Design a protein around this ligand. Structure first.
Ligand SMILES: *[C@@H]1O[C@H](CO)[C@@H](O[C@@H]2O[C@H](CO)[C@@H](O[C@@H]3O[C@H](CO)[C@@H](O)[C@H](O)[C@@H]3O)[C@H](O)[C@H]2NC(C)=O)[C@H](O)[C@H]1NC(C)=O
Ligand SMILES: *[C@@H]1O[C@H](CO)[C@@H](O[C@@H]2O[C@H](CO)[C@@H](O[C@@H]3O[C@H](CO)[C@@H](O)[C@H](O)[C@@H]3O)[C@H](O)[C@H]2NC(C)=O)[C@H](O)[C@H]1NC(C)=O
Ligand SMILES: *[C@@H]1O[C@H](CO)[C@@H](O[C@@H]2O[C@H](CO)[C@@H](O)[C@H](O)[C@H]2NC(C)=O)[C@H](O)[C@H]1NC(C)=O
Ligand SMILES: *[C@@H]1O[C@H](CO)[C@@H](O[C@@H]2O[C@H](CO)[C@@H](O)[C@H](O)[C@H]2NC(C)=O)[C@H](O)[C@H]1NC(C)=O
Ligand SMILES: *[C@@H]1O[C@H](CO)[C@@H](O[C@@H]2O[C@H](CO)[C@@H](O)[C@H](O)[C@H]2NC(C)=O)[C@H](O)[C@H]1NC(C)=O
Ligand SMILES: *[C@@H]1O[C@H](CO)[C@@H](O[C@@H]2O[C@H](CO)[C@@H](O)[C@H](O)[C@H]2NC(C)=O)[C@H](O)[C@H]1NC(C)=O
Ligand SMILES: *[C@@H]1O[C@H](CO)[C@@H](O)[C@H](O)[C@H]1NC(C)=O
Ligand SMILES: *[C@@H]1O[C@H](CO)[C@@H](O)[C@H](O)[C@H]1NC(C)=O
Ligand SMILES: *[C@@H]1O[C@H](CO)[C@@H](O)[C@H](O)[C@H]1NC(C)=O
Ligand SMILES: *[C@@H]1O[C@H](CO)[C@@H](O)[C@H](O)[C@H]1NC(C)=O
Lengths: 221, 593, 87, 221, 593, 87
């Protein structure tokens, strides 16, 4: 085989300083993952994925460092119709992945310089479609103030004005209110499917980033 | 017409065919089966794939079998679905109803996920996001594998009615070495594991006591994995306990459900950041049916059964079913216990009972008054005598059950424990070596349960502090620092540069994280206090020591309790010059004794 | 020997294929004791027998067709061999 | 006019944490400046330039934030044949500038989110063709060990093995040895033109980054 | 054929035409001219552009004129080219030979660039990297502007033979407000500025003294800009001083060139980080011609003329022309001065002369031995008496020339000055208010000129330290910390936690920035020292004080110098218990007195 | 009025243009008291007089053509007007 699963992962010191904060993207939209890696000595570059819902391990798509050919595509079983890309600026290379974000394809994506054995994580992106918030039984419904990226650790949505929320029952007395970006259908008609599990594989990372506005979320220690 | 032809070339002149209707392949389950396997792979690739998965007899503990008699109104349904074995190598991915519940440890690189189905369950252990180890137990389907492998190299342990099948990459044995040991799960399988009552006593709590004593929680080790597997097996047994709907004596069902919920809560606190939202565990009797069948005749005449029932209802995420009078009676029982074991170590029965009450008030939002009245009592039993008796308790090896090791000092509102307070408690200058180190971790384990109080949910969980819900209207927080908004009386420094700060707030107001200096009112004093109509009832006292950590908070409910506490003959108050005694009245008054 | 399949979406599902063929070792020179070929409207594909037979058996079990599978599975018996011993 | 020169600049906190270290690129090669800005609220994005040799002030190329049209191109008088680029990418836009690097076009390039008055510098790139090093009269010629980007503050070249040096007289007793990337002509034939001024507009930034290997360079305070 | 037709449409029937040959436009001059102007813009755009540039009589100081008699073997050439006014708005960009010299202040957002041409020069002041202000002086071409603007709104000052042209964006007047003052440059233009001898005395040094006293160096303010303009004007005047090649008395040319080089060096140290590499300033006589004409007859009998000539050669970047014997004679003169003004404040003549020598040794790499012998002397004149006299000097207003304010304490190898050492020098407990504040900044201005020594270029310029080149073979560095590799004798702590560290190294070895502890040899002692053949000659002594900063290093060359120093009557040695005296000999010995 | 120019490289240099024309106010209705037009192969452009005439004056000065420019510059006199007073 061209390689195996990364055995000696490493993280660049800019890994957690340059990774954009989680992003809320409307369901059914054609998101794409950008990237930019300076000219290197690594034979292979790749994009590593970890889907939030019902997934374990990692799946990676391996591109030749210079030419841009495909050497191995592990994202098959979850992204049958994803199209990659590779453009060469003599100064540095660019590669991208494109798909149709939905409930099953939200997760973390990481550019990874690669060779046969090792790897060096460089950047991370988190894609979300539904976010959990808890409301007390009688308190008025919260009202977050999502805005476009801005800068910092605030969760953001490229289309904040299409924000809509729904409630999915109770949890330890609280009422679970979920936030999502709609308008996929006309007006308020659209209502996503109720999430089938929480906390999920992405719970740890997401809850480390603040949500602008007043709202309560269970948080790590 | 439009059928698919299967032929085997009888001869060049003519071939024999099977005319399989295409309707049999109409369902999408055919395609999603096909896309998971590359049919172009040669035998060499299949041999290579098997070369990386460690085999039972060649790399793991050798195969061996056990045999024993496996035996002790709407039925529940798995209202949740998950994709089993997604993107796996040796197994087909399928979409089925399931009970999926994931635990995420402190370390972002580790997590354990438990999945259960109708006839078998799965345990997923993940390290550093690589391919995880899988433990599968139950009735296995005939065609689970994606290629015609020899599955007899994968069943690690076989029982009278089920078998254990293990998949793990050969590179992972440098970590999951416990597989190589022949004792793995010998204590959890080699008996009638369908006997839930004996199962919990013999297998789960056995691991729980050891893990708690050794302080291995939050770390993925052999004992924790064995615990998780035992928990999953216990859940599997519950579904097997006569779902047909045989008549059940309610107290027995209450005990069974209470044990299961205790197990789940312990694992949540031992291996998870926050509880899983899934809840709605399948039980012999639906919680609504229990409620109605037990409150139509008022069949409950025992307080213990009532507290167990309320625990079941609260943990099952059905708060709206809890009436106020039952909680009032629970609070009355709590006050009874407070009067009984005042300023002394809790008897085993008291510990076991009060464990449920302490774990209850933190899992509700209705009836804040009674919950406060119970929380204050749970905090007020943490007398230094209780700490000493707990210290002597830990050294005892005869601890069958996990409940016996409960202490109100752990999960209550006091979260400022340190080795200094523990060590200085002993005049012998000696403590059983393991205990003074283990109790620190035991009492510092994080339940993080203060969100269920409107005026305190914003209080940071890291810094040491103390909380006291003396009554409905008032709520005191004692801190080394001005943490939250409200009236804040400063007190003499424990050490120059560190101040014992007392914050008084009203429960009817939202929690606020104000760190500024304001309303820094001074401490008042009174000597010949007035007890007319017991204006001092429902008050908490604190003996602040000038040159060391604060110690030994106590809560007095009635006039008799405060009379007992004041009486120096009981050693509650000593009046030494170094230490000073303070009173926190039911209203906002803070004064010196 | 076998038609390279660069992508899975390229590989026809049951909605496009029309005939699946087999040839035993009696006429096939392959070391696998046989060969299999399929028919699609645009291009045929060569595929290894044993993998296809295992997939067919898995599908049959999934739909619980064992009752009606006697003759068919018996006919596939020659190709269900090569069960992978660890070596 | 669509806008004026930036009246009130700002710098992102990642400005000096994400700007790649200076790069040495042979003359006559077609470099392109990558960039990646997350979805924002700024009407205009632009690329700002400061050429090293005989230049003052700044010149800006302003693109509409969303569509990608051109609104104003100040780089004309120095980059008559430079071609820009814009690729809408719903998660976040991308734009680039291409040219033929030479002696007159080396300098600093900075992506700048823009509106009519303000601006927000986001990233910086430094392009160099000749670097100065000083050698003592009798000491043997130095030998730097340029390599591909790797990571850090080390000057780097996408083609280190084409490194060549020449001397351009004396300075305060020292001998000035210059380093450049050659092979534009066969073997050692090509010799760049002698630099006409030092320290130039780019001297301050460049000399703050180390050069791997043993060598002496006049350094800021 | 192939010509271009210019026509004006005499009539529809026929038009009159000019048949201009295309050869007149064959050259690239036309093309680079056309691309700089948009021929499609309307009058509105041109009006808008002018609205942004402040005008002389409307925004700046009103126009006014001055009039005076402007008057006092290969010729040089501008061996350097630059693109004047690149990407400008009102002016055409052109490529011409020029003298281009850029200064970059401490702050990265500021820099001043000086450009000169045959008949006019340009001063560019840049802030924040926006469009820079421009001052243009000299004979201006007829068609400089890019559009037919009214240039009379831009000339700020006019002279008998030249005009001053100022361009600045209207938004920039919030910073360059000095333009609004009518006094701007009144002292640098309103006289016969071609009289260089009077020019430097009246205009440049006048600004230099004030800037140095007020400590405005490294900051872009009115005085610094006036200084830069005066320097550019002085350079312009020099090129105008009879380049035809009239006979010149060599001493006068030496004085003129030395003054110009002093000006350039002062500006380099005051307004830049590193010297501009351009050098090769055009002079009345080429440096090679001066060298050969002067060393053919050995006409330089005056030592001062010799040092001036060596300074000229060294600064002009022609080191290879300097012979060894001349430097030996310079070192002998330095020793003469050392003997003369030993342990006393330097007379004005001594300061002026030794300034050149101190600035010389730092700008060469040949003859390291003699450079060391001069550097040690330059360091050894920094006696506390010199500090006091310089302190009193700094308050005098009668300082015509910048040389008089030189002190060896500044540029020499002692770079550990602090207000504590200065303040404690006074028993009155009083120093003229501004003087102690100004002395620190004057003595802490950074030449960073230790790079010209093979064994010390490694040494960081930040940390306080001391350097001493006692001889050719040995070289001591005294520091609070182990900075460089070599033998390092520790000494008693100045304060507990801080130590006086003495490092001894051999000059013939390249240095390395080794911070490790090694060869931490102990201090030896000797009382009845042996002076046979003056084994103590060429040695430096230091009176270390235990409870304060180290002070008052001294260097003894011959036996007589050490005899004088030891004699306590001269107050060189006091022998107080707190202070201790050490000897650093020509070899590696470090010992106590 | 004036042929819009999007990029300088598009604007012909002297290598491509073949004739430059002028029309005074006596026949032109423009407020600029005239107009000028140039011709390049299959491309004509409209340009304002005064800016152009200033450019030719600058070119003449740079090339030192004042001696030979008498008649030409005299002919450009009607268009060299509109000197930009600050208002
Ligand atoms: C995939 O790339 C990694 C890049 O690190 C390769 O590992 C690297 O192997 C080189 C071999 O020379 C190691 O360089 C040497 O390592 C030690 C420690 O410094 C020492 O001998 C030298 O100073 C030198 O640096 C390098 O350290 C090592 N990197 C790591 C992180 O261990 C790896 O071999 C590549 N894979 C293949 C199949 O080539
Ligand atoms: C170009 O974009 C900048 C983005 O900052 C615009 O300046 C911003 O203008 C808004 C106007 O509401 C300012 O918001 C307010 O500012 C103050 C300070 O916080 C206060 O009134 C409010 O809390 C609110 O935040 C914002 O501060 C200001 N940004 C900065 C850095 O000063 C600018 O106006 C835009 N240009 C045009 C022509 O619209
Ligand atoms: C099982 O899950 C279903 C999912 O639909 C739940 O039904 C939904 O319940 C929510 C509130 O929890 C309502 O807002 C929806 O309208 C319900 N949907 C339908 C189709 O009825 C159902 O309550 C769950 N049952 C249990 C016992 O948990
Ligand atoms: C809290 O309750 C106590 C009960 O004793 C109140 O005590 C009174 O305090 C005032 C001064 O504040 C005295 O004049 C009264 O004599 C006290 N009453 C008695 C019965 O002793 C106290 O005031 C209350 N505080 C608040 C804030 O309501
Ligand atoms: C003026 O600049 C020219 C630029 O070519 C210099 O000529 C070069 O000098 C270097 C050494 O400095 C030689 O290596 C080159 O071979 C020279 N080139 C040519 C074409 O001769 C010249 O030395 C400079 N003159 C002065 C006085 O500085
Ligand atoms: C440096 O020179 C002095 C000159 O006095 C040397 O002094 C000698 O020191 C040794 C002990 O180190 C004594 O035994 C000798 O008697 C001294 N000699 C004389 C003539 O007094 C000193 O050793 C020299 N140091 C080095 C390192 O060479
Ligand atoms: C994805 O979404 C796009 C529109 O955003 C749509 O055209 C396309 O059909 C969808 N499906 C796939 C497989 O890309
Ligand atoms: C890369 O993306 C561009 C649009 O950004 C698209 O035109 C092109 O086809 C893509 N390349 C591949 C190989 O899919
Ligand atoms: C730039 O260089 C490329 C080759 O790198 C060449 O084809 C092209 O003609 C050059 N010129 C311009 C204007 O880009
Ligand atoms: C952008 O670059 C691509 C190659 O990366 C090129 O094909 C395309 O034409 C460029 N776009 C423009 C507008 O020049």
């Amino acid at each position: 085989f061209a390689t195996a699963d990364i055995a000696e992962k490493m993280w660049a010191e800019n890994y957690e300083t340059t990774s954009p904060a989680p992003v809320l993207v409307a369901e059914g939209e054609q998101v794409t993952i950008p990237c930019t890696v300076m000219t290197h000595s690594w034979p292979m570059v790749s994009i590593r994925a970890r889907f939030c819902r019902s997934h374990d391990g990692s799946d990676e798509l391996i591109l030749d460092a210079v030419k841009g050919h495909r050497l191995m595509n592990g994202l098959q079983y979850r992204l049958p119709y994803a199209t990659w890309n590779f453009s060469q600026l003599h100064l540095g290379q660019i590669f991208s992945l494109t798909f149709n974000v939905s409930t099953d394809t939200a997760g973390m994506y990481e550019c990874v310089l690669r060779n046969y054995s090792h790897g060096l994580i460089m950047q991370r992106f988190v894609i979300l479609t539904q976010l959990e918030t808890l409301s007390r039984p009688d308190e008025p419904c919260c009202t977050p103030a999502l805005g476009r990226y801005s800068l910092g650790d605030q969760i953001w949505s490229p289309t904040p004005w299409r924000l809509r929320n729904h409630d999915c029952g109770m949890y330890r007395g609280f009422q679970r209110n979920y936030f999502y970006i709609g308008r996929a259908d006309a007006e308020d008609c659209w209502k996503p499917a109720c999430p089938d599990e929480e906390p999920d594989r992405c719970w740890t990372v997401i809850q480390r980033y603040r949500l602008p506005g007043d709202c309560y979320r269970s948080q790590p220690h | 017409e439009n059928a698919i032809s299967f032929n085997f070339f009888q001869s060049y002149n003519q071939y024999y065919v099977f005319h399989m209707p295409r309707c049999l392949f109409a369902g999408p389950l055919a395609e999603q089966f096909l896309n998971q396997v590359d049919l172009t792979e040669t035998l060499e690739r299949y041999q290579q794939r098997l070369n990386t998965y460690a085999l039972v007899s060649k790399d793991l503990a050798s195969y061996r079998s056990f045999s024993q008699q496996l035996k002790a109104l709407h039925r529940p349904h798995f209202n949740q679905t998950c994709i089993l074995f997604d993107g796996h190598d040796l197994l087909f991915s399928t979409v089925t109803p399931c009970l999926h519940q994931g635990f995420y440890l402190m370390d972002e690189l580790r997590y354990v996920k438990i999945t259960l189905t109708e006839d078998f369950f799965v345990v997923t252990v993940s390290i550093d996001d690589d391919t995880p180890m899988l433990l599968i137990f139950g009735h296995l389907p005939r065609v689970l594998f994606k290629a015609p492998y020899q599955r007899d190299n994968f069943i690690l342990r076989q029982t009278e009615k089920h078998e254990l099948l293990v998949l793990v990459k050969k590179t992972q044995l440098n970590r999951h070495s416990y597989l190589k040991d022949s004792d793995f799960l010998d204590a959890a399988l080699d008996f009638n594991y369908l006997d839930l009552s004996a199962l919990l006593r013999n297998s789960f709590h056995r691991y729980a006591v050891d893990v708690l004593k050794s302080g291995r929680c939050q770390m993925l080790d052999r004992r924790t994995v064995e615990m998780a597997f035992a928990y999953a097996l216990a859940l599997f047994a519950a579904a097997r306990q006569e779902e047909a709907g045989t008549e059940i004596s309610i107290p027995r069902a209450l005990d069974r459900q209470a044990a299961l919920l205790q197990i789940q809560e312990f694992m949540i606190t031992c291996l998870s950041q926050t509880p899983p939202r899934t809840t709605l565990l399948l039980y012999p009797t639906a919680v609504d049916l229990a409620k109605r069948a037990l409150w139509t005749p008022d069949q409950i005449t025992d307080i213990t059964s009532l507290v167990r029932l309320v625990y079941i209802l609260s943990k099952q995420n059905q708060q709206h079913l809890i009436p106020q009078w039952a909680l009032r009676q629970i609070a009355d029982f709590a006050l009874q216990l407070h009067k009984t074991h005042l300023a002394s170590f809790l008897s085993a029965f008291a510990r076991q009972e009060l464990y449920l009450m302490g774990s209850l008030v933190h899992s509700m939002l209705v009836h804040t008054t009674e919950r406060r009245e119970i929380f204050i009592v749970e905090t007020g039993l943490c007398s230094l005598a209780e700490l000493s008796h707990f210290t002597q308790l830990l050294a005892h090896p005869h601890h069958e059950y996990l409940s016996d090791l409960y202490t109100p000092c752990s999960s209550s509102g006091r979260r400022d424990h340190s080795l200094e307070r523990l060590t200085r408690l002993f005049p012998d200058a000696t403590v059983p070596a393991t205990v003074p180190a283990a109790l620190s971790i035991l009492s510092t384990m994080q339940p993080s349960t203060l969100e269920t109080f409107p005026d305190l949910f914003c209080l940071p969980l890291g810094e040491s502090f103390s909380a006291l819900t003396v009554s409905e209207h008032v709520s005191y927080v004692v801190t080394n620092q001005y943490l939250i908004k409200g009236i804040s009386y400063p007190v003499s420094t424990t050490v120059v540069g560190q101040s014992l700060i007392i914050t008084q707030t009203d429960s009817q107001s939202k929690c606020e994280l104000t760190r500024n200096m304001h309303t820094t009112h001074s401490i008042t004093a009174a000597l010949n206090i007035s007890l007319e109509n017991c204006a001092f009832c429902q008050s908490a006292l604190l003996e602040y020591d000038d040159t060391q950590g604060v110690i030994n908070i106590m809560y007095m409910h009635d006039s008799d309790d405060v009379l007992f506490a004041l009486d120096p003959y009981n050693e509650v108050v000593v009046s030494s010059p170094r230490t000073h005694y303070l009173m926190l009245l039911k209203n906002g008054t803070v004064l010196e004794v | 020997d076998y038609s390279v399949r660069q992508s899975s979406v390229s590989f026809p599902p049951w909605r496009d294929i029309d005939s699946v063929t087999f040839v035993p070792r009696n006429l096939s020179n392959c070391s696998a004791h046989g060969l299999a070929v399929i028919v699609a409207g645009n291009q045929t594909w060569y595929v290894n027998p044993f993998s296809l037979a295992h997939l067919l058996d898995a599908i049959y079990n999934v739909l619980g067709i064992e009752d009606l599978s006697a003759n068919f599975r018996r006919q596939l018996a020659p190709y269900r061999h090569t069960l992978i011993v660890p070596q």
